[model samples]
Target: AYEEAEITKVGAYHRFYSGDKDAITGENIVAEKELDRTNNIDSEHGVATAVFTIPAAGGKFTEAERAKVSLSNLVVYVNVSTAARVTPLDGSPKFGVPADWTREHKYSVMAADGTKKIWTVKVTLNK
Candidate 1:
């Protein structure tokens, strides 16, 4: 034999799936929920992955502006021209690469959580 019981926690967000047909609506059904930044460290690592997408149309600076453009330096392994090389450039508006050039490039960003340093997993993009 078994007994049935119900337990709940205060200030907690939970979802009960009655069925696939369940439609979510209203603030009670959808709203900001406290993110559990603790257990999902691996998922965050995906952000560290290197990612380079072709620059979007417009908002691109002229070559003269690019001459003065500088990115926050980061030591990374890159192959911008078919040769494996490390570059000291990491940030938006990638240098040495022309916009509208679509190729899958990879890189990483420093994790935005806690101290002691964290590296995002490699990410790739072709945009």
Candidate 2:
């Protein structure tokens, strides 16, 4: 069936807050946020302040847009490359803090090929 992990498929992103809870005891959330598995407006891209841009050179990009982040004291989470992973097994929030997303959080990912690389997820908001 399944084998090892390759963070190459990290196109899925999520949003969270201090009190934000993971999906119900039976669910998934991260990939449900503002992503387009098939296609959607979120898939629209290539602009200065465009809604989303996948990014380049193994870096990060804005998974959301201006109005995409209208919540309060919001925090965020992403994938990684340590001995273990913290990218919400079921869309859970990791190190989620109650404040502006000013910090350019750091993340890491390990390819099934055993190649490890660290990346950052930059979540932005607008007025």
Candidate 3:
């Protein structure tokens, strides 16, 4: 199921960038920090950020688990295609990717050259 979702998501991205002349280039995009649970976040290859696994079941988490899922210390680093400065769309600090781990989060990367990229990050509780 995860694989299918990822495939479909990539298809959508391809369609979105197909005709665009200034779409984000693949080689220069980077997410410089490791994700919470997995080390598979690869922006260069267009993979979504890692699947953050929380130790919870049935959509419920214990106090310790909740504390462990905080994203306050996390930082997402990106090296753009043309050495452009990147900033979060929310005007918050770059490390503020939200601590809620129950749903997928979409963050936008705005370049200095007016180009944009959307990053999809997912957090899932362990079964």
Candidate 4:
């Protein structure tokens, strides 16, 4: 059966260039900082930034089990092409995991640039 994971909290870090010119400097600068997923606020000027979130699993499983499952379902990406990478956010494993753990799912985007984007999600399997 398929079940939906309840997200307790959301966190992210995003950095992207605004392409807007500065009032005084009139020069482009890189933006970098943490992001608040709850609110709709954004950085002033960032070319690109790493966004991350730690949503509450709703106590879906004990720390150990969640660690295992999180590690198993981790996903990572650098540009857009090439193989997708997975990172153990739970820090359960220090090294990389087996490639077989991932199942590629292609997606189409119109506004996205050629640069690759990384995404990840966690879910509970069983009690």
Candidate 5:
């Protein structure tokens, strides 16, 4: 049998699993993928939850970055095993579309072996 299906997107972003052992079932914010004007990315694969914050240029989050909130949407890519798939549960925000990311969203990673894992992603705009 083959190894478990994991999220390669996580590897491209942070060192979540030391390398990769078919356990990472979370998110990833690739360079030139979902966002660009972001820093201090904190992705936790263990908990299947990740978060990131965008800081204001000056000292207060009440300007261009806040007036419009540049980071209001994201697109996550997860590569599973052969036949495996990753999908968002109902009520979860669909990736790629612009939306209010100030709240946490959920996702499900289903392996080819029928195993499933839940992942949560949250975005924060510093104030």
Candidate 6:
């Protein structure tokens, strides 16, 4: 029975799940893919910091330009050694990058066990 119990414990430790449901078995709950600088708009330049350059035409940005620079499709992937949920401080999972959106945005990753992690997104524009 000792061998069997050891195997069961090992299996529990390796288990992973994602969602808002509680785990039926004991396991470590964690955010598998919380938002980071690498997943942001300016990720190519690095992480966290996003830089947008005005068109050569140079003026205020148009609606199409705004859509192109927005972070509306950004998403955080949480894994469930249990279950988890992602929430943004602005109350929306998606965010828009405005011509005047030179500010930092925050997103929260909440684990089933009540653990929370905060991620930030910063944007800058080039003259």
Winner by TM-score: 5
Residues 3-121, candidate 5, lDDT per residue (tens digit)?
34444342111111122233375544222212222322223562333344333344322244334433454433344456667777788766545555556667776777778766665
User: After TM-score superposition, what is the CA distance of residue 99 in candidate 6 from its true location, in Å?
Assistant: 7.9
Identify the candidate with maximal lDDT.
5
Tens digit per residue, CA lDDT, model 1, 1-127: 0121111110111122222342554223322212111111233332223333323222223333223312222112322112222222254324233222133233323222311222232323332
What's the residue-level lDDT of 69 in candidate 3? Answer: 38
Model 4 spans with C-alpha error above 4 angstroms: 1-47, 69-73, 76-127
Comparing 2 and 6 on TM-score, the stronger one: 2
Sorted by TM-score, highest first, which candidate order results? 5, 3, 2, 6, 4, 1
Model 3: residues with Cα > 4 Å off, grouped in runs = 1-37, 42-47, 52-94, 125-127
Taking all chains together, each candidate's TM-score versus the true structure is 0.19, 0.32, 0.35, 0.20, 0.46, 0.31
Count clashes in each candidate, considering only residues at least 3 apart in sequence or on different chains: 13, 2, 0, 13, 0, 2
Candidate 4, lDDT over the whole model: 0.30
Error of 2 at 46 (Å): 18
- Candidates 1 and 6 compared: the better one by TM-score is 6
Worst 10 residues of 5 by lDDT: 11-20
User: Which pairs of residues have clashing backbones in candidate 6?
Assistant: 17-80, 37-48
The parts of candidate 2 lying over 4 Å away from their true place are 1-72, 77-100
Residue-wise C-alpha lDDT for candidate 6, range 1-127, written one tens digit per residue: 1111000000001112333354786554432221112223322332244444433321233334333333323322222123555465674334321122435556554656666655554544443
- Overall local distance difference test of candidate 6: 0.35
User: Cα RMSDs of all predictions?
Assistant: 20.4, 12.5, 17.0, 19.6, 13.0, 17.4
**Per the 3 Å backbone cut-off, how many clashing residue pairs does candidate 3 have?**
0
List the global CA lDDT of all models: 0.25, 0.34, 0.37, 0.30, 0.45, 0.35
